[PDB]
Amino acid sequence: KTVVVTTILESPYVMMKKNHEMLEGNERYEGYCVDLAAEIAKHCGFKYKLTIVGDGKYGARDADTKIWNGMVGELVYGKADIAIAPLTITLVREEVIDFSKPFMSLGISIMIKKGTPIESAEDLSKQTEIAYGTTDSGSTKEFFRRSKIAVFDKMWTYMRSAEPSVFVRTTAEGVARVRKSKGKYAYLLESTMNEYIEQRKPCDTMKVGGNLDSKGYGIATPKGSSLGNAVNLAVLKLNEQGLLDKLKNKWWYDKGEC
Amino acid sequence: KTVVVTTILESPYVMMKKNHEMLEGNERYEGYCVDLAAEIAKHCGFKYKLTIVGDGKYGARDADTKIWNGMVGELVYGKADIAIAPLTITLVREEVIDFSKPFMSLGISIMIKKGTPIESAEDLSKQTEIAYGTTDSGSTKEFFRRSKIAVFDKMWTYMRSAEPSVFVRTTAEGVARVRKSKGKYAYLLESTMNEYIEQRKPCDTMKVGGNLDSKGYGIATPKGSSLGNAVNLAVLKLNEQGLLDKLKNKWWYDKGEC
Ligand SMILES: C=C(C)[C@H]1CN[C@H](C(=O)O)[C@H]1CC(=O)O
Ligand SMILES: C=C(C)[C@H]1CN[C@H](C(=O)O)[C@H]1CC(=O)O
């Protein structure tokens, strides 16, 4: 049967083509994950249909209800057969779905509006004039929450009680906040998005310091899925033959606007 | 039963303590992987015994005999229950044993003796005065062999026919060759070892350019192993709680001699 792929609109992984209203099926989308999905299906011998996750979320479990939302939820409840998106491999998600080995490596980073007097997380922790936060859901927020690490602890304690909220709903919101806060807001996000945005007009943002940790994005399938093993080998095969780095340069730097 | 862990002597992952002749059991060893093994066993609730792989190899399959050697072979033939070492996650190995998600991220890098007029793989490819090669077995050699990539292809073609051989048997051999060749030999090795050696006396080596690819080291277990699932979750748990980065700084930079 045709494999149902769930994904999410996040640049430059999956984006609607400018003329999407005139197209149908998979041709309506473009991006790193759209190309990766084609390669995975090709190497695994299956036909597929790209779909955008119904609730527009990545995947977290609600306290109290214990229900999984986002792409993870669609896999958990059988609404989709595979998730191909910038879904960070985490302990809680690994417990309910299967992840392929990383197709992309990344780490938590700091985004500032050019000119902001901040060079590291250390600088952020030892001050409050410049507010800073993470996405309101996701692996970055969890990193600070579970962090023994010192400077990261002063940061989580600060972010948790900061008013107004320093957390943003999406990457677009965090970037807009950095750009419109005249240097008074720094956004903690994954290096992949940071590096991408740095090469997009208005070219007014910058990634500072080194990554705070090392993690990866993985292709997800429901536990005990037949396609799981084949997809994992496909990711390794594509990475070893340079397809993945070629794909990143295509969507990150070949398209640089700065 | 006590879990048999197979590992390999590779600095600073596993090293014999200076006074090892006076110790017994696991206390004879020290290093990043020795500490990681303790953490994995603790989080997985098992007793273990560290052993050094009999043939002193990582794991490759012989053509003609089709027999697996090294740590991979010990897992494949049931001589060990788990491998905890800087074993690169690769397609061919993933097909015969199970790998946990990466406990360390790395990429192929270039090591030169300080002063060598080389800054990138591109520089290496467009010349021959300065010889360069990889370890005679392993994932780095395979990267160049399977590389479509252009400059990397000119490099593999050159390395394959270069005389005398530009390939080295071990990290120690590659480093000794770089140090004793008066700038006429550059070694292609994993960034982890490169970064480590750069901070070790004589402090005469340097890592140049950016990594050529992105890969990781994983903990290995025989296929269908009971411990596999638990070990994978332990790696993710330890990484999220900062144990892994803390462990890398302990063995890489806290001990810097330069
Ligand atoms: C864009 C979002 C909400 C994602 C993408 N990867 C992370 C995840 O899969 O949780 C989230 C980012 C972050 O947490 O910084
Ligand atoms: C040190 C050795 C021989 C190893 C360690 N990781 C790689 C592996 O697991 O193949 C090899 C290095 C390399 O290929 O550059």
From Swiss-Prot, chains A, B:
Its Gene Ontology cellular component terms are: AMPA glutamate receptor complex; asymmetric synapse; axon; cell surface; dendrite; dendrite cytoplasm; dendrite membrane; dendritic shaft
**Domain text:** The M4 transmembrane segment mediates tetramerization and is required for cell surface expression.
> Could you tell me the Gene Ontology terms of the biological process aspect for this record?
cellular response to amine stimulus; cellular response to brain-derived neurotrophic factor stimulus; cellular response to glycine; cerebral cortex development; chemical synaptic transmission; conditioned place preference; establishment of protein localization; ionotropic glutamate receptor signaling pathway
**Processing after translation:** Palmitoylated. Depalmitoylated upon L-glutamate stimulation.
Q: Which residues of the full protein are shown?
A: 414 to 794 of 883
Site feature (Crucial to convey clamshell closure to channel opening) residues: 118
Give the GO molecular function terms: AMPA glutamate receptor activity; amyloid-beta binding; cytoskeletal protein binding; extracellular ligand-gated monoatomic ion channel activity; extracellularly glutamate-gated ion channel activity; glutamate receptor binding; glutamate-gated calcium ion channel activity; glutamate-gated receptor activity
Task: Look up the further comments and give them.
Answer: The postsynaptic actions of L-glutamate are mediated by a variety of receptors that are named according to their selective agonists. This receptor binds AMPA (quisqualate) > L-glutamate > kainate.
Q: Site annotation (Interaction with the cone snail toxin Con-ikot-ikot): which residues?
A: 61, 145, 237
User: Which UniProt key words apply to this protein?
Assistant: Cell membrane, Disulfide bond, Glycoprotein, Ion channel, Ion transport, Ligand-gated ion channel, Lipoprotein, Membrane, Palmitate, Phosphoprotein, Postsynaptic cell membrane, Receptor, Signal, Synapse, Transmembrane, Transmembrane helix, Transport, Ubl conjugation
Induction is noted as:
Down-regulated in the pyramidal cell layer of CA1 in the hippocampus by global ischemia.
Q: In which tissues is it expressed?
A: Detected in forebrain. Detected in dendrites of neuronal cells. Expressed in the pyramidal cell layers of CA1 and CA3 and in the granule cell layer of the dentate gyrus.
Q: Which residues carry this modification: Phosphoserine?
A: 147, 181
Q: Which domain of life is it from?
A: Eukaryota
Documented effect of changing residue 239 to D: Increases rate of desensitization
Could you tell me what this protein is called? Glutamate receptor 2
Give the Extracellular membrane side ranges. 117-258
Species for this entry: Rattus norvegicus
Q: Which family does it belong to?
A: Belongs to the glutamate-gated ion channel (TC 1.A.10.1) family. GRIA2 subfamily.
In UniProt terms, what function does this protein have?
Ionotropic glutamate receptor that functions as a ligand-gated cation channel, gated by L-glutamate and glutamatergic agonists such as alpha-amino-3-hydroxy-5-methyl-4-isoxazolepropionic acid (AMPA), quisqualic acid, and kainic acid. L-glutamate acts as an excitatory neurotransmitter at many synapses in the central nervous system and plays an important role in fast excitatory synaptic transmission.
Has the keyword Isomerase been applied to this entry? no
Ranked from the top, the taxonomy reads: Eukaryota, Metazoa, Chordata, Craniata, Vertebrata
Cysteine disulfide links: 203-258
The principal localisation class reads: membrane
| Subcellular location field | Cell membrane; Postsynaptic cell membrane; Postsynaptic density membrane
The residues the record assigns to binding L-glutamate are 86, 88, 93, 139-140, 190
On subunit structure and binding partners, the annotation says:
Homotetramer or heterotetramer of pore-forming glutamate receptor subunits. Tetramers may be formed by the dimerization of dimers. May interact with MPP4. Forms a ternary complex with GRIP1 and CSPG4. Interacts with ATAD1 in an ATP-dependent manner. ATAD1-catalyzed ATP hydrolysis disrupts binding to ATAD1 and to GRIP1 and leads to AMPAR complex disassembly. Interacts with GRIP2. Interacts with GRIP1. Interacts with NSF via its C-terminus. Interacts with CACNG2, PICK1 and GRIP2. Interacts with GRIA1 and SYNDIG1. Part of a complex containing GRIA2, NSF and NAPA and/or NAPB.
